[model samples]
Target chain A: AREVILAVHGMTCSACTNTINTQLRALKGVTKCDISLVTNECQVTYDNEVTADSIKEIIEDCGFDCEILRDS
Target chain B: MAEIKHYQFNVVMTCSGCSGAVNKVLTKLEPDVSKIDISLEKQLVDVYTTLPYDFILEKIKKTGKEVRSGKQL
Candidate 1:
């Protein structure tokens, strides 16, 4: 598994972070996720089988802008 | 064939969660929904659908978000 950080935009409150956390947690290869409404950033650990594009797509699908900051 | 329609709705979306919830709902409509766009700053959503506007509105309302108004555009 690998870790990644993404900059998320357009989140207004804790509820928005909650929704992102909920949706990402539901994905099979997602092992962990931390999202901060204050920072508008997300740090995630997921299986290598999961592509960064998939993560970005899910966040975008949730109605926000997501940009990959780094992958480790 | 059902005629496609364009609608603009004024919805109360305070956060991304609200818009995300609405996206989830409308995405389920799939082929019936040609396009969907939301503006949090404006609190408005534009949806193009072949489904009835009332049906779409009902589904959007089911998300428990307040929709102030909607009309064909």
Candidate 2:
């Protein structure tokens, strides 16, 4: 649990964020995932062992792009 | 044969901040190429070399990234 990632697009009123969090938590290395339904902001904490590609694949599959925002 | 070498580079470009850096270096190495892009999302650069591969590698050393083969040559 070190870094967080954000998706490029989607406003579910944040349903998209919730959906993403649900999916990510199910993954083997995903420790925790939190998505902001109000502001439509989402973030996840995971180990560095998690390569960016897998996360991107998950987001893309769910209709988004996972962009690693500068650690904030 | 027209021996053109395309090199892939890995660099940190969060925004477009690295564009000029990329262009300057690639151009200096292969004057004929004149174009370079540093894409963080793509995680690589697509560089074309008009000269032979060996010569391209010489200048590439300055870029500090390994060159992987690119698509649809």
Candidate 3:
């Protein structure tokens, strides 16, 4: 399955974006992830093995916020 | 030079599907467009080409509404 991400409100620095990228990529089965700083959204291609909730938690732990933006 | 000109408009497009109809006519004349992007939110169609924009504007008028022109990029 594919994954989509939305930025939670109030990210104030590029460091926030980088941390989001790092945490999301570290998850299992994530094939590729790309994000737009302007849109505050992300598109992630991942295998069926991972759940979006798990992805969201990882980013939340990193001090940013996420929501599912779209799906394939 | 081929008189390359690019334009963006803020007018309405009858439908997102109308772009397909317009694209068929627009690109046939000049395929040198470096970029052509349509944004539904912006209600805009942007075009870059070497042919005269008047030729394009005239042809697009076949859709029965004036395609308002934009200033040069």
Candidate 4:
């Protein structure tokens, strides 16, 4: 599994982060997701089937703008 | 053009941010969607749109909020 940090935008409150967290955790390859509303960053741990781009797309689909910041 | 209609949905929105996300996505429908009324306290989203019920429902669901019920009004 790999980990990635995504920069997310347009999250106004805890509900926003909760929404992103719920959706990211629901993805098949995603094992863990931690999102910070104050910092607008999301850390995700996922398997090979999950690409950083795909993770970003999931966040975007949840009504926010997202970009891959880095991965490890 | 498709006939426009009113739709109401029961979504789990705990705060303005949750309702705002729902509003943002539905607004993208633009001309197809004429109006939107969201009540976070009531956990209801009312939309006037030419789009189908299922499509609107899915759009709201995409926001990662639980939609408990939806119907045409």
Q: What would the TM-scores of all predictions be?
A: 0.58, 0.41, 0.42, 0.83
Candidate ranking (DockQ, best to worst): 4, 1, 2, 3
User: lDDT tens digits, residues B1-73, model 2?
Assistant: 6566566655444334234334544555545664455666776777766656555455444333334543424
Q: On a 0 to 1 DockQ scale, where is model 4? A: 0.64
Ranking by TM-score: 4, 1, 3, 2
lDDT of 3 by residue, B1-67 (tens): 8776778765455544445445544555555766667776776778888867676565554333334
For each candidate, report its DockQ versus the true two-chain complex.
Answer: 0.13, 0.02, 0.01, 0.64
Candidate 3, pairs of clashing residues = none
What lDDT score belongs to each candidate, Candidate 1 first?
Answer: 0.76, 0.54, 0.59, 0.76
Top-DockQ structure, candidate number: 4
lDDT (10s digit) by residue, model 2, range A1-72: 676656454434432245455666767777777765545456778766666666665554444434766443
Task: Report chain A TM-scores, every model.
Answer: 0.85, 0.68, 0.70, 0.82
Give the C-alpha lDDT of model 3: 0.59
Evaluated on chain B only, what are the TM-scores of all the candidate structures, in order? Answer: 0.91, 0.48, 0.70, 0.89
Question: How far does residue A25 in candidate 1 sit from its true spot (Å)?
Answer: 1.3
Give the least accurate 10-residue stretch of model 4 chain A, judged by summed lDDT.
Answer: A11-20
In CAPRI terms, where does candidate 4 land? medium
Q: Write the per-residue lDDT of candidate 4 for residues B1-73, one digit (tens) a residue.
A: 6888988888877777676667667767877888888887777888887777788767766777887888887
Report the C-alpha displacement of residue B17, candidate 4, in angstroms.
Answer: 0.8
Each prediction's total of clashing residue pairs, residues at least 3 apart in sequence or on different chains, is 0, 1, 0, 0
Ranking 3 against 4 by lDDT, winner: 4
DockQ of candidate 1 is: 0.13
